[PDB]
Design a protein around this ligand. Sequence first.
Ligand code: FES
Ligand SMILES: [K+]
Ligand SMILES: [K+]
Ligand SMILES: [K+]
Ligand SMILES: [Mg+2]
Ligand SMILES: [Mg+2]
Ligand SMILES: [Mg+2]
Ligand SMILES: [Mg+2]
Ligand SMILES: [Mg+2]
Ligand SMILES: [Mg+2]
Ligand SMILES: [Zn+2]
Lengths: 52, 77, 110, 168, 295, 193, 119, 86, 54
Amino acid sequence: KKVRPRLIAELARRVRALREQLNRPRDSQLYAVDYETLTRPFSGRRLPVRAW
Amino acid sequence: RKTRHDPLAKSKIERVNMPPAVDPAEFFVLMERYQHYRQTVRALRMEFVSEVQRKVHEARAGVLAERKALKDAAEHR
Amino acid sequence: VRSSVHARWIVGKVIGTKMQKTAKVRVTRLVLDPYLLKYFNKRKTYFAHDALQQCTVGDIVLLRALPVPRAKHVKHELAEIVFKVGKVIDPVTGKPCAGTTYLESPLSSE
Amino acid sequence: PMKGRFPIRRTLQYLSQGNVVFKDSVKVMTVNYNTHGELGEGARKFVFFNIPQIQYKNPWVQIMMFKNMTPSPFLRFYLDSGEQVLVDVETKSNKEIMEHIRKILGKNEETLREEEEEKKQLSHPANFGPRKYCLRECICEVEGQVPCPSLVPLPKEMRGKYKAALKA
Amino acid sequence: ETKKPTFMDEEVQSILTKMTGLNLQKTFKPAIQELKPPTYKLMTQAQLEEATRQAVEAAKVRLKMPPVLEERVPINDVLAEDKILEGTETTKYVFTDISYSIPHRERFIVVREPSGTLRKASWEERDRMIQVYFPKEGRKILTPIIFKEENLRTMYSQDRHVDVLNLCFAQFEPDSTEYIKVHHKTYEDIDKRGKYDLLRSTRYFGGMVWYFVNNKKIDGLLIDQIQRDLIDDATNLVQLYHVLHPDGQSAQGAKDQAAEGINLIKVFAKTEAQKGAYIELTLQTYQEALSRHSA
Amino acid sequence: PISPYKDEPWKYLESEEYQERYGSRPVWADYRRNHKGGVPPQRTRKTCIRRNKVVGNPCPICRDHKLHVDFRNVKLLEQFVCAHTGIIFYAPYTGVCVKQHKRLTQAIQKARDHGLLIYHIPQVEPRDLDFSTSHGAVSATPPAPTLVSGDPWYPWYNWKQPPERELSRLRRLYQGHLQEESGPPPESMPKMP
Amino acid sequence: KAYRGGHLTIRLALGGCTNRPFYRIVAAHNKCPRDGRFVEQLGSYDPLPNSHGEKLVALNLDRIRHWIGCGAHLSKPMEKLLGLAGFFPLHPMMITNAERLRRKRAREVLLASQKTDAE
Amino acid sequence: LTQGLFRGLSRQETHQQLADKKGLHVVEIREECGPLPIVVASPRGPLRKDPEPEDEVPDVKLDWEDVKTAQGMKRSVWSNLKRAAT
Amino acid sequence: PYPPLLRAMIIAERQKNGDTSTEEPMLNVQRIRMEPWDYPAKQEDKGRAKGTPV
RNA sequence: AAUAGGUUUGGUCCUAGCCUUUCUAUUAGCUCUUAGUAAGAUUACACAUGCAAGCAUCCCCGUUCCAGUGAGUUCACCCUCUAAAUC
Ligand code: FES
Ligand SMILES: [K+]
Ligand SMILES: [K+]
Ligand SMILES: [K+]
Ligand SMILES: [Mg+2]
Ligand SMILES: [Mg+2]
Ligand SMILES: [Mg+2]
Ligand SMILES: [Mg+2]
Ligand SMILES: [Mg+2]
Ligand SMILES: [Mg+2]
Ligand SMILES: [Zn+2]
């Protein structure tokens, strides 16, 4: 009845959280935009038409 | 439905969603109606929330509830 | 008055005193046999904290649930020794008895 | 035939005839009785006939029995507050013992009637769903409403197969 | 000042309870239904008299008279007229509050018409909606055809007036117009054919008497009670008539003559009774047979 | 064949031909199903008349073409109802095919609904404990001021022409993606002449 | 099934059969399937007119008020049902869609009159 | 089976015999007739005045098949099957 | 005002409890302050795009 | 196992197994007119192709749901405590 510990799941959880704080993208990356295509190069997603 | 890991369809890569056209007279009138409707419904929601809280307090520490608790305790002694 | 322990009050027989400040108590409950519709004793073991180590194997004790368990298996404390083994006091008369016989007559103190 | 004396005790009908439903305070009921002696006969019949009914109506109350530990029979109840109720039963019949503990620690008929009524609120007649939970599964079972298509085919006009055909 | 009694007055209920009668063989007639093997008890003469006494108590409950109510007034109440909704729907919506713990006569049941009007449901819609969501055993959403005039005459021909009233009681509310129309048509068929014994020892006898007394048509029932040697009931019937018609020719005649017992029937027979001659003859015959038994 | 009793089916049961064939017993008394085993199938045959042809062992109804299952032939229907319990016999009890058992069950119910067949009608209790009709649900509600004056329940139910500055602000905001400006709607719903 | 966030919603659960829709009004977690687990049933809605030409809507108003008071949201079709019942104000789009229907039928009537005039 | 059947059926006590043996009325209770007590047999000799003792619990032997059926625990595909009128 | 049905129920409850007031039930909206939809929201409680540069 | 039945022997009684009769589901054979409705891979084996998650004045939010499967398997229920979430 004693659940077997899952160490790889806790280890990966911490490594992911750590890497998300040390490799976090900066405002200059997230909120950049290509003014010819009107897309964000960070995700390649277009902005809404009313924002163009 | 798709998961965030599933890839975007190629037939939809260039799709641009064009917003609808706006009728200024109907648009403004409808904008005001939603303000009034949602003000009235928020007032009704507040009353319903108070009724739920009142009935909870009444059942816990009401006059009829504290009276019945003393009666049961007296009958027991 | 609240507690995280399921069994709040239980009566049982002390079956072990080898743990320090802990009495091992066998608690029996009646359980209905669904097919036979007859009640049979079902016994369960509870560890009870006994600070003064006053419990003797064989005495009937009353256990009270602790607010939170103090150990992996210790969820109750000794609340009262109901029937001391071989030293039972008749609750109806208050006189000492040995089985179904009085050791002091109730007529002594009128 | 059913084994043992008084096999009626091992029937659901007999066990449901107990009238002692303890108040929530009662946590443990110990029974001290003697196997022999004319003055402890009611306690023996109480253990033989009624303890099964008491446990059936109070499944979460611990009942423990003790033989020949004291000179006279008695019942003792342990309540959640920590209070103890000693009931002397020597010379009393089993029927008087059942009536005594019902009076001092049993729920009255009014308190039980109320609980039964609150249970009926859980099965609302107007609710539709599986027979296990509701009287009717669908509104089509109500006379006057459009019946189920599995029994009465719908008019071609109320069916999507022909709505699209005409429209298309 | 001086109020005329109601159907539920203790004086009227006592009079009608006795005129009804209690017959345990009829009140507890064997029902044609799914049967179980009977049980048996060994009883002394005292235990039997007690069991029979309990049966009489259970019968007086089964004979409890339903209250006689006046017709309910149609509901015509508009809650709102939202004309902006006119022509947006083709079918009307019926909204029923199904909150469990509300008396059915206090449940708001409203109807949104295609015109946009929010109105309270009519009495007929209410009883129909209450049956949909709170189905009562023995009641149908659509009115059964047994209550059509052609089908009631069939039931009357078979002397099944009590079944007609049991069906009407189960289908309609006591103040409904259909409930009153059926009862009145049933009482009248009894008066025309002299079938007053069909309702004795039932909860429907008092309502039948109440109808005759208020409509001044007790001549048929009074004759039936005399022909059956029920002068105590026949005398109570004439007294109930006077109580509900105090300013009448018969009530005054009884006051002027201080009539009592059988004399009341003679006063009533001459003044107000329509079949006054047939009552005196029927009453004369009774006094003769009573004298023959005396001699 | 053509039965002369189709119009007055109750007459066949009063004739001498019926009395000689059945006597005072039910029409199904002498019928026996042919089946393997001691326990019969739990359903009778679907029908004894199949495309105008009769099976070798037709059921009590199908074997006599003069027996007409009709809600008026109450003397025949009574033979398929228990006199002591009033329950309709299941089809294996009498051996009638499923087709005729449905017709019997429908005729029996139709005869009861018409009052031609006696059945037990219990005495029920009243729906309501109180018969008061004073509550607002079944009585008049005081009309609201808007309802008296004839106004909408809320003023925003009506169309109110917006100011011209507010319309210019929306024309600037949505410049290039505008529709034609709508005016006040009709006061009532129009209709096709 | 503990969901990440979410809330209770009063909404219509579709029942019935093909071409025979029937709705149960239920308070349920928004993440739950439309016809799956619910917290409580609060009424029913038959969208098909019955023999008396009526659409029957049952509302457990005591419990609807309870669940709204406990943080339950309302689906848009359910808000419109309450508007028609008079329990809520008429929804802005019930009013707006009515005005649109009037303008649409005012144009058809004008076209019909113009055609008859030409004839 | 035949010899047992005839033995059982010949050795049954009627209601009149029961009343005479115990000198009490035999009262029949029918659910179809409600609480109406129907006396089926009365003793021909004197009628006892002392009620029959009411043992709180009878020591009668029960058939497990009868008890199992009344408790809904009896499951058989062959029981309660539809059969021809007998 | 209350919605048409809600008002009728409030008035009906008054009469059942013996209240004979003719005052109209009214829904207090003073406490309901309707903010514009473009009112600046709380940025502290707003999320942020997670890192996965393309 | 039931309202039971067939079957051990030269024969009888007893015990006993097997099977028969009943009701479902799947598959096979042979056969098959219409309408409505319900249900619908053997395989946690491998998968061509298409589609199944967007929304929105940029931020965010959503894609953690729904839908699928039955490999594994007493994480499902009650109480206590207490986050996140809705109001
Ligand atoms: S079950 Fe009601 S429509 Fe099919
Ligand atoms: K065998
Ligand atoms: K196949
Ligand atoms: K599995
Ligand atoms: Mg052998
Ligand atoms: Mg041999
Ligand atoms: Mg096949
Ligand atoms: Mg799922
Ligand atoms: Mg598998
Ligand atoms: Mg929190
Ligand atoms: Zn046939």
